[PDB]
DNA sequence: GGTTTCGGT
């Protein structure tokens, strides 16, 4: 089943709804920073004090980086945009070299994992809790 | 696989 982002932990498969705060494409992979406006002690604490940043998102540990490889890259790169809502299913989590919780989509995985990411229509009621919680940090 | 919260490709 789904979990709130505050509820996920390292080294488990999980699924969640989220809003896409930031994207970044490179020759290597496609990266998303997404939030559901819940806090996880393992997320990177985003600083409001950075001179020069376009971060349209919440500050503190409210956002998780997702690294998309291969087909996931090819699919999402010119498709998933900042502001979009996404639903991610059976994705993997780990801890990076700095000890932050991070999400990864490798290739090719396998049919049995049913790992996926797909845009959610912004008018879907499943995104209601995200929208309301967003109002706690505005 | 990759490096570290920018850049804005």
C-alpha end-to-end distance: 29 Å
State the secondary-structure class. mainly beta
CATH top level assignment: Mainly Beta
Level of helix content? Answer: 10-25%
Short description:
With 138 residues, the protein is mainly beta.
How does this structure look, described?
This protein has 138 residues and is mainly beta. 10% of the residues lie in helices and 33% in strands. It has one domain (1-138): Beta Barrel (OB fold (Dihydrolipoamide Acetyltransferase, E2P)), CATH 2.40.50. The protein has helices at residues 70-76, 128-134, and strands at 13-25, 30-35, 64-68, 85-95, 101-105, 116-120. 24% of the residues are buried. The chain binds one DNA strand of 9 nucleotides through strand 1. It is found in: Nucleus; Chromosome, Telomere. This is Protection of telomeres protein 1. Single-stranded telomeric DNA-binding protein that is required to protect the 3'-end telomeric overhang. It binds the consensus sequence 5'-GGTTAC-3'. Regulates telomerase and telomere length.
Summarize this structure as a short list of keywords or feature phrases.
138 residues, OB fold (Dihydrolipoamide Acetyltransferase, E2P), 5-stranded mixed beta barrel, 2 helices, 6 strands, 10% helix, globular, DNA-binding
SSE arrangement:
Elements: E1 13-25, E2 30-35, E3 64-68, H1 70-76, E4 85-95, E5 101-105, E6 116-120, H2 128-134
The chain binds one DNA strand of 9 nucleotides through residues 22-26, 28-29, 31, 33, 44-47, 50, 52-55, 63, 65, 67, 69-70, 96-98, 100, 104, 106-107.
Subunit structure: Self-associates. Interacts with ccq1, poz1 and tpz1.
Keywords: Chromosome, DNA-binding, Nucleus, Telomere
GO biological process, one term: regulation of telomere maintenance via telomerase
């Amino acid at each position: 089943s789904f979990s709130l982002l505050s509820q996920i932990t390292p080294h488990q498969r999980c699924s969640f709804y989220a809003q896409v705060i930031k994207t970044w494409y490179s020759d290597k992979n496609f990266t998303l920073y997404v939030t559901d406006y819940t806090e996880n002690e393992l997320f990177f604490p985003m600083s409001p004090y950075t001179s020069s940043s376009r971060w349209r998102g919440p500050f503190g540990r409210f956002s998780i980086r997702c690294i998309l490889w291969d087909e996931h890259d090819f699919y999402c790169r010119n498709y998933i945009k900042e502001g979009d809502y996404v639903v991610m299913k059976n994705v993997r989590t780990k801890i990076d070299h700095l000890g932050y919780l991070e999400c990864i989509l490798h290739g090719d995985s396998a049919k049995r994992y049913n790992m996926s990411i797909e845009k959610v229509d912004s008018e879907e009621p499943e995104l209601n809790e995200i929208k309301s919680r967003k109002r706690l940090y505005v």
